[PDB]
Amino acid sequence: GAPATVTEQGEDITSKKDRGVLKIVKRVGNGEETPMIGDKVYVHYKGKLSNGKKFDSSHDRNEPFVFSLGKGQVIKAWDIGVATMKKGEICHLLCKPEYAYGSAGSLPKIPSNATLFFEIELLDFKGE
């Protein structure tokens, strides 16, 4: 399924080239510009654990998730991954725990040492 496919067929987008964050572009977005550091980014996402459980979805809340890019407000994989996206793009990200919640995990759903799968849509980005 999609997690296996991004695991085996994704592109490493880390600066360290350590395969900690792999990406597939599922829907090509608009033009060439990606967000810049500090921009307000608006995303929709779905996250799955490596046991197949869905642990979060913005679609189910009927509102996007909004954060400031590149400020460590989200897991490292999201700062790195969203920074590579164009407006209107949908991608898959496969995140090793060193770019997610590490050995700590995150209550209630994310265990220690968890590899995570996301589908992310970049709805919009704006400077403030």
């Binding site: 996250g47 642990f55 979060d56 989200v74 897991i75 999201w78 919640y101 995150s106 994310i110």
Partner: peptide, 5 residues
Amino acid sequence: DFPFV
């Protein structure tokens, strides 16, 4: 918690 941190 997620997706903060």
